[PDB]
Ligand binder design. Structure first.
Ligand SMILES: [Cl-]
Ligand SMILES: [Cl-]
Lengths: 258, 258
């Protein structure tokens, strides 16, 4: 049997490690190791998002997971949605720990514009926020913009191809979060020597109704990848609507980096 | 059609409303309404268990859900495991709001002994906590015993008949909690005029490795119920391992109290 890999999986804003409940055992039955990180103020993390003011604090559990890998171990690092920004941050710290970055229906930042660039572009373009609730919290370093998904918006825009049980689960577990847009507008650009040096691939769902297939091409034209994989019939929450096809794409990716 | 009901579902210690994610849509498809309560320090509730120092604080979100119900509305109140204690507590406060109490693989207290009686009986004969972590938290109410389940103990004793996905989910979501046995040993006995006046039924799983059949028969012999229902092949997490059969049992109950 060919070499197996260690996958580090990074969830989206307002969610938590729980999203990976279908995919983790698929990967582990094929002999791979999986670590599903829970970011700060996410899932069952005991902090409210208001206490996590910066994207570096938010991302700290991912940095700590990578820090604790033994010497010379490398992972396949998979970021979902805002998890794209998280994994780029990590890649700028620990580039030699990362065999390949998997941007899964994810923000794909560049090394030319401020780190918020691709998030700011989507916020300008997106029209279907529905019953999502937006709010602010003032910090000692400025306004921090917060969001809490509404259930109608979830159903129409994230979960529309998911089993109803999955939607019910999400309604039980989703939390107010942040896309850290102010904090990311003030951060130093992602570096070419760190983030830019790491191999990267993009995995996109064909029915993602939050991260559209033309906004992806925009991001990819803006900052190229090695390879683009497409998951036929996936919604945004592809690890819940099409976990087997997602396993298939991750499997393929593992084969290209053995 | 027959009139439908409003089910209020109460989870077990260390868990949260998320346990109900398969059952909830089954009951809603059948036309019923469903509230899955999240108890203090449970699931995504923002407080750690160290902040919830009494069973009455732990139960307060159930109390508030019952208090909020419109005038003359009555619910089918389902308590799972330690949920049995919480629904007995609620029945002693709002007995006229409850059509029937459903003890589901649950502790069934009486009105003769201290509230912790049936737990004390189990805890005395129980062995093999496995990798479960026990700790003590000192409070203005005395010592509070905390537990955090270990994953080997979960797999063997709680989830042995569940899909691997459900076991992975639970590993992602379970939290340190408490059975509040100190506080329950000190509390006033449940009253015959409140709790004792409410209709009650028991639903047991045949393969429950936490609450064994013989102990259930002893609780029911000591505090009678109107009817007993059994779910063939269910583990303790019967809402995960046999949701359809649990639905079938709750349907049968709802037909009985139309
Ligand atoms: Cl996101
Ligand atoms: Cl329990």
């Amino acid at each position: 049997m060919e070499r197996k890999h260690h996958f580090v999986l990074v969830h989206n804003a307002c969610h938590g490690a729980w999203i990976w409940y279908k995919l983790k055992p698929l990967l582990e039955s094929a002999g791979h190791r999986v670590t599903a990180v829970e970011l700060a103020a996410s899932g069952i993390d005991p902090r409210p998002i208001q206490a996590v003011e910066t994207v570096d604090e938010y991302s700290k559990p991912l940095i700590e997971t990578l820090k604790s890998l033994p010497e010379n171990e490398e992972v396949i690092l998979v970021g979902f949605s805002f998890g794209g920004i998280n994994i780029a941050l990590a890649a700028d710290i620990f580039p030699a720990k990362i065999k390949v970055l998997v941007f899964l229906n994810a923000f794909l930042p560049d090394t030319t514009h401020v780190p918020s660039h691709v998030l700011d572009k989507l916020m300008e373009m997106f029209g279907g926020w529905g019953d999502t609730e937006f709010s602010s919290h003032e910090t000692r370093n400025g306004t921090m913009s917060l969001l809490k998904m509404g259930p109608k918006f979830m159903k129409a825009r994230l979960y529309q191809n998911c089993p109803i049980e999955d939607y019910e689960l999400a309604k039980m577990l989703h939390r107010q979060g942040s896309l850290f847009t102010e904090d990311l507008s003030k951060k130093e650009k992602f570096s070419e020597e760190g983030y830019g040096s790491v191999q990267r691939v993009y995995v996109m769902s064909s029915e993602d109704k939050i991260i559209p297939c033309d906004f992806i091409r925009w991001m990819i034209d803006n900052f190229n990848v090695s390879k683009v994989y497409e998951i036929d019939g996936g919604d945004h929450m592809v690890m819940l609507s099409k976990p087997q096809k997602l396993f298939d794409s991750l499997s393929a990716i593992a084969t290209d980096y053995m």
